[PDB]
Amino acid sequence: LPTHLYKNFTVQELALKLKGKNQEFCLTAFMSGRSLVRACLSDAGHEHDTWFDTMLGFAISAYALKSRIALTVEDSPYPGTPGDLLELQICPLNGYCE
Amino acid sequence: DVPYVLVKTNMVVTSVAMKPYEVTPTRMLVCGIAAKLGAAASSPDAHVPFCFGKDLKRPGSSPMEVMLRAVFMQQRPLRMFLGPKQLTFEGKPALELIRMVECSGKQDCP
Amino acid sequence: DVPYVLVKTNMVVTSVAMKPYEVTPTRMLVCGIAAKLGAAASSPDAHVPFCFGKDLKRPGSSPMEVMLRAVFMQQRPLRMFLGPKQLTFEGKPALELIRMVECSGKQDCP
């Protein structure tokens, strides 16, 4: 589970789509000096995961507030593919995550 | 853990975070960093990690979760009852938040 | 009840509200006050009270809720189908809203 953390990144793309027949949302975190950090949270099939809706709303707020976020993605065994988002943090408004 | 309930005052929620509850998958942890307004950039109360559990089986948003949202967007000064329990947020431990009333003034919030 | 369904155009929701359903617990109302543009404050169309039900056994927001919010916030003029039913809101009867569609232009909203 090669997890990673990215602080003081901005949400640039937000998208709710369908992967085959499973719900799926993704965001692209971007920082000027670099590449795009894409992570997706997929509807694990198990209907109970309020997680999906909660993280989705939280990610929408982060997108809405235009705040720098600090995000933790795990990794996908095939490059050029968004990894799974496991935690999201909204940095102090108007500032930076320390 | 902490031996007893602390009670910070004039605190402001500065950052918020959602994380999977390390243990029970039916719950998650809403964590944040509280700061005593005006304190020394270095005093202990100038950076206070906290977390509270959210039950993923119950739809909606808990009263804490709703206030937590308002007071963050608005930066309102609060009285927080922290501890005893200690959850783990961002590597370091963090005190469980069990209550939190907005400050009216110098009266309830010194 | 009113005799039949009313269709008011260029309505602008100016106030919203929520209250329990007088006759039933498992439901509640969401109400408002729409105002037809051009109408004089004396005109009854200067303030039409509406309401609609919400099933408290199904958690979430109905499409009419979501719409209402957006159009309220945005002060979007509407075309509302009111009636034929009447519910009580703020002591008075209010027309049940069964449908509303935002206005496009004078064509559909004359």
Binding site: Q23 | - | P3, V5
Partner: protein, 196 residues
């Protein structure tokens, strides 16, 4: 250049006091007035010196002939019977994704126990219409998330790439100059991005 509801998009018995049932809605003048199947259907099933209510007018059937008379919105709800079109058509096409880009969500529509729709415009002109409902559809599961993205982009005026499925067709909008299918995705997108 309007969308005409298929003959089957019609209630067996029309409704009273202009109250078309949930999931159905009054037929327009321009809509009946452009349907050979509908008029015919009516002439072959309208008896007497009877008149019927349309959303924006009246239909004098029976011995009156089968005359469509222009009116006023909801103005003929005065009558005993108003004509209602069902708004849901199970198209039976395949679930291939179709998307429209640079669209901006405008004109919301909602109704008791049915769906929430928006008309996605681009360059002023409409492009598609999409809807979400938690009550019925193949995609009821998507409502909760979709209503969130829909509200955001609606109030903020965000251009987006909308994704619809043609497996279902809707006639909630009156006199549509655009088709209206099932919403199935929204993307705050970066030009030619993988996330679109």
């Amino acid at each position: 250049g309007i969308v005409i509801p298929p003959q089957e998009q019609i209630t067996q018995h029309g409704s009273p006091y202009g109250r078309c049932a949930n999931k159905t809605r009054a037929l327009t003048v321009a809509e009946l007035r452009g349907s050979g199947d509908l008029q015919e259907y009516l002439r072959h099933v309208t008896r007497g010196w009877s008149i019927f209510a349309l959303y924006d007018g009246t239909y004098l059937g029976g011995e009156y002939g089968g005359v469509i008379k222009d009116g006023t919105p909801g103005g003929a709800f005065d009558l005993k019977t108003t004509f209602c079109i069902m708004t849901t058509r199970n198209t039976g096409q395949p679930a291939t994704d179709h998307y429209y880009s640079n669209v901006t969500a405008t004109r919301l529509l909602s109704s008791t126990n049915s769906r929430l729709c928006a008309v996605f415009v681009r360059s002023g002109q409409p492009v598609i219409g999409a809807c979400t409902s938690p009550y019925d559809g193949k995609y009821w599961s998507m409502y909760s998330r979709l209503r969130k993205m829909l509200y955001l982009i609606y109030v903020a005026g965000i251009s987006v790439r909308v994704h619809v499925s043609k497996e279902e067709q809707y006639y909630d909008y009156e006199d549509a100059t655009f088709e209206t299918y099932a919403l199935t995705g929204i993307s705050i997108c970066n030009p030619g991005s993988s996330l679109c």
